[PDB]
Structure 1
């Protein structure tokens, strides 16, 4: 009936956003442990779902090309003005990444060497609900398996949007849908394992203990430290997951997620030691170290190194 658009196939359905590849590289961002809902369905063409709509994204040297599938078998068209603002806000393009890259490089010789090769690594501004439950699935997991669990979770619980080729696209579920009495049993069948309990328990907790999704919007305007402590009350949400949500969904650019992986990197590349191994206190100290070094956009600087580390 319908299928994935390319820039060759249907150029009449594409809108451009003037964006250098030094400000944004899709292939270093869209599948680099931030979002798990983007796939390169055709080469250099990234498809995924953004707030009840499917997008396909490609780019040149100084143009980001995008096209929308609204579904409902309605009259197909280019992206609108409001839908391009949505994409502009999603990539946080108002913030200059080149200026940030140079600012971080000024105090960090290691970052400067890595920065050379890996440009346009920025932070996506994700939905809190989507981000929270995606990073509850992240514990003792890899990008490949997390991407599976999230896709299957959205198919099972989330509303259907459109089909392109053999790929059916579902929007992310609401909290009520994940809070049901059967929710955990289904999610174990979908292969989440122990993470199934934390998804249901956290969904039920935000509803009953915090009063629905308006709470997560309150944490967006709340100070970083208040937001982090609030999230750590949720089942299966510790310091690492709280910092991820803070950094990627609650506009806290100074949030530095710390697990064994960033510990390994911090030690090997910066020679950092707690002033022996991991610990709630030692992890907290490593986050402060990077904030002190890089400043109030420390989480954005981490994404560059993190995405750089995924590519050998």
Structure 2
């Protein structure tokens, strides 16, 4: 039956949020390593799952268009007000990106050069569960492969939502689903390798040691340093993965996930070398120190700044 919508196809089923392309570029955000669930199924039209619903999004120079599929054959209709608020929050559009960009440019001529061409890179505000398992899958991995891993994970363990053309969409599974006795064996069959063990074990630990997903919501209102440390008690989550989750899902805009790529940027583009430390390359301490350097430079939205450079570098 149902088909992926285009803005031309079905105008009566799309709504608009006023949004300049300088505040948000879909093509530098939806597949640049934050969410792994969005795909450009037709030119300029991006489809993906948000919270047990499927959306399609496209934009003009000043407008963000979106359409929702409920699927549970309710009648097709335009997105409601509440659904539009959900999306406004997902893209955190209350925060001005242009003001952050100049604040960062004012102390960083490197960022200023890169910013000319790479406008509209901002941070999604993601569901903690989804973000956590997605980033556990990110170790020694690339966007394309994580994307496949995550997609097979959701088809095997989470509820079916809808089909559009040849694509069946699933919701992200709950913890109890990933914690079960065959869960690791199954995930290895789905090609996750060693990451399969950390998926299952983290699901179990959140459930049994921490009281379920209410714990991730508590981390969202706890301070950065506290949330980061608590995530690092999980199987397969270290400083880098935990910083991703802090940045992308627990409202820690100052979190700077330090890996080999940010080391390369720091050294090449900024001339940084460890000072306090003397281990001349990556180390737990030198990586903490490099996160501090970026926070010191850019201020408390350092995580967002470094996001611009990541999307820039992916082209």
Given the two structures, how large is their TM-score scaled by the length of structure 2? 0.98
Residue 74 of structure 1 deviates from its aligned partner by: 1.5
Counterpart Cα distance in 1 of 2:225 and 2:195: 25
SS at match of 1:20: coil
Q: CA deviation at 1:261?
A: 1.1
Task: Measure, in 2, the Cα distance between the counterparts of 1:175 and 1:75.
Answer: 31
Per the alignment, in what secondary structure is the counterpart of residue 33 of structure 1? coil
Note the alpha carbon deviations across 1:163-195, whole angstroms, 9 max, x for none.
000000000000000000000000000000000
In structure 2, which of residues 271, 288, 291 is the aligned counterpart of residue 287 of structure 1? Answer: 291
In the TM superposition, residue 302 of structure 1 has moved relative to its aligned partner by 0.6
Measured in 2, the distance between the counterparts of 1:301 and 1:200 equals: 33
CA deviation after TM superposition for structure 1 residue 140, in Å: 0.1
What do residues 252-310 of structure 1 show as CA deviations (whole Å, max 9, x unaligned)?
00000001111111111001111011000011000000000000000000110000000
In 2, distance between residues paired with 1:115 and 1:6?
30
What is the distance in 1 between the residues matched to 2:266 and 2:78? 45
Offset at 1:72? Answer: 1.0
Describe the SS at the equivalent of 2:27: helix
Give the equivalent residue in structure 2 for 1:195.
Answer: 195
- Please give the alpha-carbon distance, in whole angstroms, between the structure 2 residues aligned to 1:231 and 1:183: 21
Give me the whole-angstrom Cα distance separating, in 1, the residues matched to 2:159 and 2:169.
9
C-alpha separation between the residues in 1 aligned to 2:251 and 2:20?
23
Q: Distance in 1 between matches of 2:288 and 2:198?
A: 23
SS at match of 1:24: coil
Instruction: Could you tell me which runs of 5 or more consecutive residues in structure 2 were left unpaired when the two chains were aligned.
Output: none
Residues 268-287 of structure 1 aligned to structure 2 (within 5 Å)? 268-275=268-275, 276-287=280-291
- Partners of 1:108 and 1:296 in 2: how far apart? 15
Aligned residue number for residue 160 of structure 1: 160
CA distance in 2, matches of 1:29, 1:270: 24
Q: Distance in 2 between matches of 1:146 and 1:197?
A: 16
In structure 1, C-alpha distance between the alignment counterparts of 2:127 and 2:21, rounded to whole Å? 25
Equivalent pairs, count: 311
Query: Secondary structure in 2 aligned to 1:72?
Result: coil
Deviations 1:133-189 (A, max 9, x none): 000000000000000000000000000000000000000000000000000000000
CA distance in structure 1 between the aligned counterparts of 2:241 and 2:11, rounded to whole angstroms:
40
Which whole-Å CA distance do the structure 2 matches of 1:296 and 1:110 have between them?
18
Give the corresponding residue for 2:309: 305
The separation in 2 between residues aligned to 1:107 and 1:249, in whole angstroms, is: 27
Shift of 1:73: 1.8
Q: CA deviation at 1:121?
A: 0.2
In 1, the alpha carbon distance for the partners of 2:242 and 2:145 equals 21
What is the CA deviation profile of residues 198-243 of structure 1, one whole-angstrom value per residue up to 9, with x for unaligned ones? Answer: 0000000000011000000000000000000000000000000000
Root-mean-square deviation over aligned CA pairs:
0.4
Q: Distance in 2 between matches of 1:107 and 1:210?
A: 42
- Is the partner of 1:66 in helix, strand or coil? strand
SS in 1 for 2:135: helix
In 2, the alpha carbon distance for the partners of 1:103 and 1:251 equals 20
TM-score for both structures, normalised by structure 1: 0.99
Deviations along 1:95-149, one digit per CA (max 9) or x if unpaired, are: 0000000000000000000000000000000000000000000000000000000
SS of residue in 2 equivalent to 1:163: strand
1:18 Cα offset (Å): 0.2
CA separation in 2, counterparts of 1:286 and 1:263?
8
Q: Distance in 2 between matches of 1:183 and 1:87?
A: 32
Distance 2:164 2:267 in 1: 45
